[PDB]
Ligand binder design. Structure first.
Ligand SMILES: CCNC(=O)N1CCc2cc3c(c(OC)c2[C@@H]1[C@H]1OCc2c1ccc(OC)c2OC)OCO3
Ligand SMILES: Nc1nc2c(ncn2[C@@H]2O[C@H](COP(=O)(O)OP(=O)(O)OP(=O)(O)O)[C@@H](O)[C@H]2O)c(=O)[nH]1
Ligand SMILES: Nc1ncnc2c1ncn2[C@@H]1O[C@H](COP(=O)(O)OP(=O)(O)CP(=O)(O)O)[C@@H](O)[C@H]1O
Ligand SMILES: Nc1nc2c(ncn2[C@@H]2O[C@H](COP(=O)(O)OP(=O)(O)O)[C@@H](O)[C@H]2O)c(=O)[nH]1
Ligand SMILES: [Ca+2]
Ligand SMILES: [Ca+2]
Ligand SMILES: [Ca+2]
Ligand SMILES: [Mg+2]
Ligand SMILES: [Mg+2]
Ligand SMILES: [Mg+2]
Lengths: 423, 348, 55, 438
């Protein structure tokens, strides 16, 4: 059945995860009570990828909700689709993580992680053929970042032959909660480098710039940012949720070198509330490749595409899709490495997302992503050179050496991208 | 936007074509190893024809005809003329030639015909050529000819030397007529309006074949072994206008009537012969190619074909015009951009 | 251009036309060795991963 | 009569198999329930069609076929398809987790767990054969199962059935319908390991089938169903001699004798004509000369390449429909005077011709129009090496950077196998050039 086990950790992880399940529950026709009320059997074809079928033909998401304080998850349980989640899959503590990677990874999180693994094991055991895991979290906080990456490490040890996939929100000073986010993000990226196969890099400043510059939102909220994320998560999981397409074949074709598995996602259209105008296939294709539609705040013209995955949704001309996709890479062939032939693959899906007749989702493995890790590295070093705010972490048992190593690991990752941007 | 690649940096003709293409703003040059090109200016040797026409959404065109080497190699050219019914072994415009392997071989047939001439008192002077170039021997005895071929170590051809060439006056000197011919993807044959005569500056001396400054008209031999180099014409290059005026004032005839009709006939014959073997009509990629035909005219105003060059150069004064013509009929015909034609279409 | 070996039946016929005349597999054990060798390298890589995760 | 067992590996092999056996049934008058009214011998017989179909006491004609895929989704369609009645459960073998487009995963990791089961299911079919000729193996080059598991099966088949012949129908990868970036790796890995174990292999480039479907059938965006119906027509005309009365290519051994003088160069080029759209109301029926002339047009070949710039080692003409030898030799004569047909010196310049009077059968509701006569040409020409060159070049581009190599090493494969397979393809390319160029 190629089941996927979903995990959302921390405030950001649970808020974007909640929106994700609300979006795809609507696409598959599942209501807030888990009852199916769709009109197309295409909605139930691969519904078992994300949903378990309970008694009465109810559909329960295969989702585990994790946090070190109850606040954000209480609001999920009281949210629109809060009732579709299995109550047993809410695992939370009370102390919180204080935006502290050490608390999430070493102290507060360590005390709770075994409880989470018990639920993961219960969901995995009842899988006919487990594909792997999908984790939503931020890297700037404490729970999603620190306990999220601790969870990934424990999951890999118990399921070493399964695929690990994350949606990872990268912090930005433009949309910041605390000054320590670069510390938490730098410590997490190394965990991700070693223990994930595919990571969608979602940059909060990109999301902000899109809400402000393009969507014409004067004062974007986290809710507005999460609208872009849920629409993007629906797009990048379309090929997994409808006939066509699993996490391993995606990794095999998207990841030519094991460490370079950090993707830039994109979405089109993203229109300001003009929302009724039809979009032609050429327009979808140009916007989907446009930097302004990328979620990583990286300039693709500053690097090269190792691999690209594209997904077109809606009723349209596949002939015209192929033509426009060939036109993009035939007119800008300099931005696609020549040592990976035919590194752009396109999928189509007749089911469009809610509100749009046509949509295009972009998944790029570009060397330009190094600009994201370089930003984090600079912000990290600016504080670390003065050991600023370190006491929050040494107070939890960490020592300075572990920060020096995280810094070096980050700069090696940046260098590895640079060697292929010129090779 | 159209894209192309350059894989022969030594090509003077297509270095200008590349400059013209870029100068239009509607063509973009890529890296020599990028496969997403519309147009390939391929290398002279081992051009990978097998990798063309397999790029979805790209009409691909190359500036060489796969298989045209049969026409542009001195050995295989003789084989082509002797074994092709269209160009019979008795065609009147190609000198009697034989393929001689130093170490399928016609060494015995050459001696037989040599003895026929040796028996009678008919002119028995032959010339030996090969692919090295840059290696030519003109002797009256067969022994000396065959001996030089075994010492070189390459496939050669023994061809009858034109003992009675047409001599330009003043000077009493030999010459050569280069013609540029363009064949497009539809296998239209275009003869460049402008030809060039490569003339010897030394007076043709029938007594001494050792001094090959008057017998050989190659521009390289004249610019290094000729004391009168550049005396009669600039760079020993006479163009059609002057040569035509000469034929009128001296021989009371025109270049078109006395020579150009035979040239067009020869060009048409050679190219029509191999059309089934090299045409890209129904092929998954398209080809065009610029050829250089070399002709010799005897004193009876009879034209003889001596060689066909598949990667020829051009005359300095004619580079601009010809290269622009290439872009117009060979490249822009397949890839249109956004009448005083310089070519003569040899219909067939 | 000669036709030779013409054979006719109710379903059809076949013949030949000539235009011109002319001028140790590995054993079951050796395969098991390769398969088992690849599995050992696969178990060695996982043990290293588990050892790394144990540190 | 000697039986032939068909084996379909991976998605491409399985779906092409379903199209072929559908066509076989229509050709032999076998209904979806396995019944064959024309077969007056019930429960047995040694007729020509019994080379591919066995018989039960109830009168069911069961294909001598095995389907094997490392995931169940494709074979489950056979279990529920129109011809589900045709096969029984023992013939359909499905795994749980596919090879993820990874040769090493299909060959080593996953293949090791299921190879014994497949061989045992094949032994069952072999045990009901009075005299087995060999096997017909359908698979793709680019898929992880089609490439990796096929090469493993071919090795074991040689061990268990050393004297038996093995033929291949191989799907060569084309980006227009491609499914993986690493297909050049898998193609070269599986060709290297299968080369010594295959007596004769018919490559089909999806690019050619794709364009033939767009050009001659007016299909804007052809699907696998369109491609497989056309491929099955060509497979059908290649196997017709094994399934009908005749004297040409009557057993698998004869394919090697007539098409493969040198063992390593065992990839004949297939060319088929005519392909006519069924939506065309008015269509002028083509003649014997016209369809024979079309066998020398690259646009009709199963692999795009230029035979004018290679040399032939053998040529077979397989006609179906209203064709008599007189028309064939008349068409061949005129074609030889207009085509560049160059044979190697150590081979006779000629054609082995086979005619089956029954015109090609077309699947009702399909895309191919009914025609009065068709032909498939099987020519072993060095020009097909252009497909190796293309493939080896893509391999060289990626492997020079070691791109994606870690996926294969991670499954237990050694990096050295990459270079060994590439070195074997390098020798293969030079063998073709040594045979076809002067
Ligand atoms: C049967 C699947 N068919 C298929 O066309 N695709 C292409 C697009 C796509 C997009 C997805 C996705 C996918 O997989 C579930 C796929 C798959 C996948 O598998 C082959 C493949 C894939 C992705 C990229 C590739 O190359 C760069 C590639 O190589 C051919 O999940 C997230 O968004
Ligand atoms: N002609 C044709 N080609 C196919 C078909 N199915 C897949 N292919 C081609 O086969 C290649 C992919 O190999 P598959 O057969 O799908 O993979 P597989 O053998 O199932 O192995 P896995 O990796 O385990 O899925 C691609 O090049 C496809 O274009 C088909 O039905 N017809
Ligand atoms: N059969 C023949 N009869 C008379 N003169 C001949 C001849 N063959 C060659 N020549 C003379 O020898 C010269 C060299 O001959 P050829 O054209 O084969 O050399 P080449 O390859 O250097 C010319 P290009 O530089 O155009 O390729 C000719 O220009 C001609 O003057
Ligand atoms: N896009 C998005 N980002 C968020 C949201 N909530 C917090 N963040 C970001 O996540 C980081 C803070 O981590 P958070 O999830 O709140 O801490 P945690 O609960 O310990 O995991 C900061 O970079 C915030 O900008 C949200 O709802 N949406
Ligand atoms: Ca506690
Ligand atoms: Ca019977
Ligand atoms: Ca054998
Ligand atoms: Mg918070
Ligand atoms: Mg020359
Ligand atoms: Mg498969």
């Amino acid at each position: 059945m190629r089941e996927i086990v979903h995990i959302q950790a921390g405030q950001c992880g649970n808020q974007i995860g909640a929106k994700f399940w609300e979006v795809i529950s609507d696409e598959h026709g599942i209501d807030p009570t888990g009852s199916y009320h769709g009109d197309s059997d295409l909605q139930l074809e691969r519904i078992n990828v994300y949903y378990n079928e309970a008694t009465g033909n109810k559909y329960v998401p295969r989702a585990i909700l994790v946090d070190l304080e109850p606040g954000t998850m209480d609001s999920v349980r009281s949210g629109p689709f809060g009732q579709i989640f299995r109550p047993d899959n809410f695992v939370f503590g009370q102390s919180g993580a204080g935006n502290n990677w050490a608390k999430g990874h070493y102290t507060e999180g360590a005390e709770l992680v075994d409880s989470v693994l018990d639920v993961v094991r219960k969901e995995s055991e009842s899988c006919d053929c487990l594909q792997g895991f999908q984790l939503t979290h931020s890297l700037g906080g404490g729970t999603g970042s620190g306990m999220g990456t601790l969870l990934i490490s424990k999951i890999r040890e118990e399921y070493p032959d399964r695929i690990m996939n994350t949606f990872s929100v990268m912090p930005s000073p433009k949309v910041s909660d605390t000054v320590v986010e670069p510390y938490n993000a730098t410590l997490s990226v190394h965990q991700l480098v070693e223990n994930t196969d595919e990571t969608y890099c979602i940059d909060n400043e990109a999301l902000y710039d899109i809400c402000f510059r393009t969507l014409k939102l004067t004062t974007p909220t986290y809710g507005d940012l999460n609208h872009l994320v849920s629409a993007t998560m629906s797009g990048v999981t379309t090929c997994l949720r409808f006939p066509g397409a699993d996490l391993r074949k995606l990794a095999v074709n998207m990841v030519p070198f094991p460490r370079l598995h950090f993707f830039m996602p994109g979405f089109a259209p993203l229109t300001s509330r003009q929302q009724y105008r039809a979009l032609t296939v050429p327009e979808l294709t140009q916007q989907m490749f446009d930097s302004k539609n990328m979620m990583a705040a990286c300039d693709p013209r500053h690097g090269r595409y190792l691999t690209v995955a594209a997904i077109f949704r809606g009723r349209m001309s596949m002939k015209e899709v192929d033509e426009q996709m060939l036109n993009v890479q035939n007119k800008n062939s300099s931005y696609f490495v020549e040592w990976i032939p035919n590194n752009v693959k396109t999928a189509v899906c007749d089911i469009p997302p809610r509100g749009l007749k046509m949509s295009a989702t972009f998944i790029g493995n570009s060397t330009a992503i190094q600009e994201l890790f370089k930003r984090i590295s600079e912000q990290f070093t600016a504080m670390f050179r003065r050991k600023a705010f370190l006491h929050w972490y040494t107070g939890e048992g960490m020592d300075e050496m572990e920060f020096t190593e995280a810094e070096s690991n980050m700069n090696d990752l940046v260098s590895e991208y640079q060697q292929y941007q010129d090779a | 936007m159209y894209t192309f690649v350059v894989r022969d940096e030594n090509s003077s003709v297509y270095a200008e074509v590349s400059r013209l293409l870029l100068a239009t703003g509607q063509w973009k040059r890529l890296r020599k190893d990028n496969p997403r090109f519309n147009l390939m200016l391929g290398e002279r040797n081992r051009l990978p024809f097998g990798r063309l026409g397999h790029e979805p959404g790209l009409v691909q065109l190359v500036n060489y005809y796969r298989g045209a080497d049969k026409l542009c190699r001195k050995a295989s050219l003789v084989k082509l003329i002797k074994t092709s019914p269209e160009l019979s072994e008795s065609c009147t415009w190609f000198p009697e030639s034989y393929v001689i392997y130093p170490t399928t071989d016609e060494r015995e047939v050459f001696l037989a015909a040599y003895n026929r001439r040796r028996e009678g008192r008919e002119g028995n002077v032959w010339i030996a050529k090969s692919s090295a170039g840059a290696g030519i021997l003109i002797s009256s005895e067969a022994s000396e000819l065959l001996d030089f071929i075994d010492e070189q170590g390459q496939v050669h051809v023994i061809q009858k030397y034109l003992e009675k060439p047409l001599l330009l006056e003043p000077g009493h000197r030999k010459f050569d007529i280069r013609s540029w011919v363009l064949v497009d993807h539809l296998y239209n044959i275009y003869l460049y309006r402008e030809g060039v005569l490569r003339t010897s500056s030394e007076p043709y001396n029938s007594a001494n074949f050792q001094d090959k400054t008057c017998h050989l008209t190659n521009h390289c031999i004249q610019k290094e072994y000729s004391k009168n180099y550049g005396r009669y014409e600039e760079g020993n290059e006479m163009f059609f206008e002057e040569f035509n005026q000469y034929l009128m004032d001296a021989l009371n005839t025109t270049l078109e009537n006395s020579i150009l009709l035979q040239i067009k006939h020869i060009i048409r014959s050679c190219l029509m012969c191999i059309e089934p073997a090299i045409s890209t009509k129904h092929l998954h990629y398209q080809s065009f190619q610029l050829f250089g035909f070399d002709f010799m005219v005897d004193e009876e105003l009879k034209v003889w074909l001596i060689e066909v060059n598949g990667a020829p150069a051009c005359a300095q004064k004619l580079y601009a015009e010809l290269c622009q013509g290439i872009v117009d009929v060979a490249i822009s015909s397949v890839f249109p951009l956004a009448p005083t034609s310089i070519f003569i279409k040899l219909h067939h | 251009m000669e036709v030779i070996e013409l054979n006719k039946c109710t379903s059809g016929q076949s013949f030949e036309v000539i235009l011109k005349p002319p001028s140790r597999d590995p054993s079951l054990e050796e395969i098991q060795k390769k398969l088992e060798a690849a599995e050992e390298r696969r178990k060695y890589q996982e043990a290293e991963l588990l050892k790394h995760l144990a540190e | 009569m000697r039986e032939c067992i068909s084996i379909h590996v991976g998605q491409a092999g399985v779906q092409i198999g379903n199209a072929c056996w559908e066509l076989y049934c229509l050709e032999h008058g076998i209904q979806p329930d396995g019944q064959m009214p024309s077969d007056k011998t019930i429960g047995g017989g040694d007729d020509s069609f019994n080379t591919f179909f066995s018989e039960t006491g109830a009168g069911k004609h069961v294909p001598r076929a095995v389907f094997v895929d490392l995931e169940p989704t494709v074979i489950d369609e056979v279990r529920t398809g129109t011809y589900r009645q045709l096969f029984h459960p023992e013939q359909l073998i499905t795994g749980k987790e596919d090879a993820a487009n990874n040769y090493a995963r299909g060959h080593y990791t996953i293949g090791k767990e299921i190879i014994d089961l497949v061989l045992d299911r094949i032994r069952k079919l072999a045990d009901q054969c009075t005299g087995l000729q060999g096997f017909l193996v359908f698979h793709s080059f680019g898929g992880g199962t089609g490439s990796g598991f096929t090469s493993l099966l071919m090795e074991r088949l040689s061990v268990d059935y050393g004297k038996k012949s093995k033929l291949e129908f191989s799907i060569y990868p084309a980006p227009q319908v491609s499914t993986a970036v690493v297909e050049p790796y898998n193609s070269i890995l599986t060709t290297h390991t299968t080369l010594e174990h295959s007596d004769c292999a018919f490559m089909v480039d999806n690019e050619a089938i794709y364009d033939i479907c767009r050009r001659n059938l007016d299909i804007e965006r052809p699907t696998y169903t369109n491609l497989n119906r056309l491929i099955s027509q060509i497979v059908s005309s290649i196997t017709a001699s094994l399934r009908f009365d005749g004297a040409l290519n009557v057993d698998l051994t004869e394919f090697q004798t007539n098409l493969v003088p040198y063992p390593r160069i065992h990839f004949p080029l297939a060319t088929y004509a005519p392909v006519i759209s069924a939506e065309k109301a008015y269509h002028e029926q083509l003649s014997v000369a016209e369809i024979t002339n079309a066998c020398f047009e690259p646009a009709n070949q199963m692999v795009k390449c230029d035979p004018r710039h290679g040399k032939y080692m053998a040529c077979c003409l397989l006609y179906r429909g209203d064709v008599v030898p007189k028309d064939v030799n008349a068409a061949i004569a005129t074609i030889k005077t207009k085509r560049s047909i160059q044979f190697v010196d150590w081979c006779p310049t000629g054609f082995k011709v086979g005619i089956n009077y029954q015109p090609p059968t077309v699947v009702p509701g399909g895309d191919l129009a009914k025609v009065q006569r068709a032909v498939c040409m099987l020519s072993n020409t060095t020009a097909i090496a252009e497909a190796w060159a293309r493939l080896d070049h893509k391999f060289d581009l990626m492997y020079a950077k070691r791109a994606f190599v870690h996926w294969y090493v991670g499954e237990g494969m050694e990096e050295g196998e990459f270079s060994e397979a590439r070195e074997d393809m390098a020798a293969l390319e030079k063998d073709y050039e040594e045979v076809g160029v002067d």
